[PDB]
Design a protein around this ligand. Structure first.
Ligand SMILES: N#Cc1ccc(N2CCCC2)cn1
Length: 292
């Protein structure tokens, strides 16, 4: 079925939980043996969220190459993403090692450091220009260059230096700051505006390594971001945009990381975002919306 009318049909019939459970039943199950080794227990935030062996990102280290991070490679859309958990106190150096080794331009953060009164990830970037961070275990230096705070998100320019070679690179930090502590946003408008800002920066483009995207576990909000992006790109590429099947795209992405989209509310929100986004992209869109 098409998307917008399949959407109204699920709303009127109140069957979002059944649709979502079907996805959970059909999703791939692949081994994650490296994640479960005893030496990696303090490298995982949640015992039930692990990268598959076949798609995990390897650190370029001979002692321990493990990080909780997965490469999602979308062949028809020609986009790749790295989805990862929010960094832990003992993995902030590994996180920036991955950004460096994979040649990423951008980091997309979809959570706040504290939510619901508990810590959801480490404070892994510097908050003041004159107070840089040094990660001694991986030999990297990280400096805040500039910060632009807007009503729904903040963008930061960061400098990452490999202290071994003295090479430097500019990294862009895109921080969506207004996802509610409970549930999903009422409107997808600010989330879509944010997606378009990430796109406009070059961070998703083939001349760079894959974007790194995270929330707390790296499967829920993070899954919503890459699912919406890929579906909108496919609607632009294909002769028949109504052929894009969001449930089939989600199952393809779940071949590369478990658990993407954590609730039926997140599934409904993803449909809403793609539906509204497809109108702004256009044939029915103004030439001037790219400025909206
Ligand atoms: N190309 C392009 C494009 C399309 C839409 C767009 N947005 C609509 C809402 C504000 C930003 C931006 N750029």
């Amino acid at each position: 079925m098409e998307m917008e009318k399949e959407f109204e049909q699920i709303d009127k019939s109140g069957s979002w939980a059944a649709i979502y459970q079907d996805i959970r039943h059909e999703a791939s199950d692949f081994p994650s043996r490296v994640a479960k080794l005893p030496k990696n227990k303090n490298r995982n935030r949640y015992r039930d969220v692990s990268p598959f062996d076949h798609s995990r990102i390897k650190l370029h280290q001979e002692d321990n190459d493990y990080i909780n991070a997965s490469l999602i490679k979308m062949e028809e859309a020609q986009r790749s993403y790295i989805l990862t958990q929010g960094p832990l106190p003992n993995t902030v150096g590994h996180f920036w090692e991955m950004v460096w080794e994979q040649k990423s331009r951008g980091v997309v953060m979809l959570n706040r450091v504290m939510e619901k009164g508990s810590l959801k990830c480490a404070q892994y970037w510097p908050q003041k220009e004159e107070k840089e961070m040094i990660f001694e275990d991986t030999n990297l230096k990280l400096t805040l260059i500039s910060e632009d705070i807007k009503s729904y998100y903040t963008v930061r320019q960061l400098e990452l230096e490999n202290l071994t070679t003295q090479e430097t690179r500019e990294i862009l930090h895109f921080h969506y700051t207004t996802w509610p502590d409970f549930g999903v946003p009422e409107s997808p408008a600010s989330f879509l505006n944010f997606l378009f800002k990430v796109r406009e920066s070059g961070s998703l483009s083939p001349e760079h390594g894959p974007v790194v995207v995270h929330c707390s576990a790296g499967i829920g909000r993070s899954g919503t971001f890459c699912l919406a992006d890929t579906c909108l790109l496919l609607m632009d590429k294909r002769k028949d945009p109504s052929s894009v099947d969001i449930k089939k795209v989600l199952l393809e992405m779940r071949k590369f990381r478990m658990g993407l989209i954590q609730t039926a509310d997140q599934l409904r929100f993803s449909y809403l975002a793609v539906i509204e986004g497809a109108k702004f992209i256009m044939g029915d869109s103004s030439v001037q919306d790219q400025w909206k």
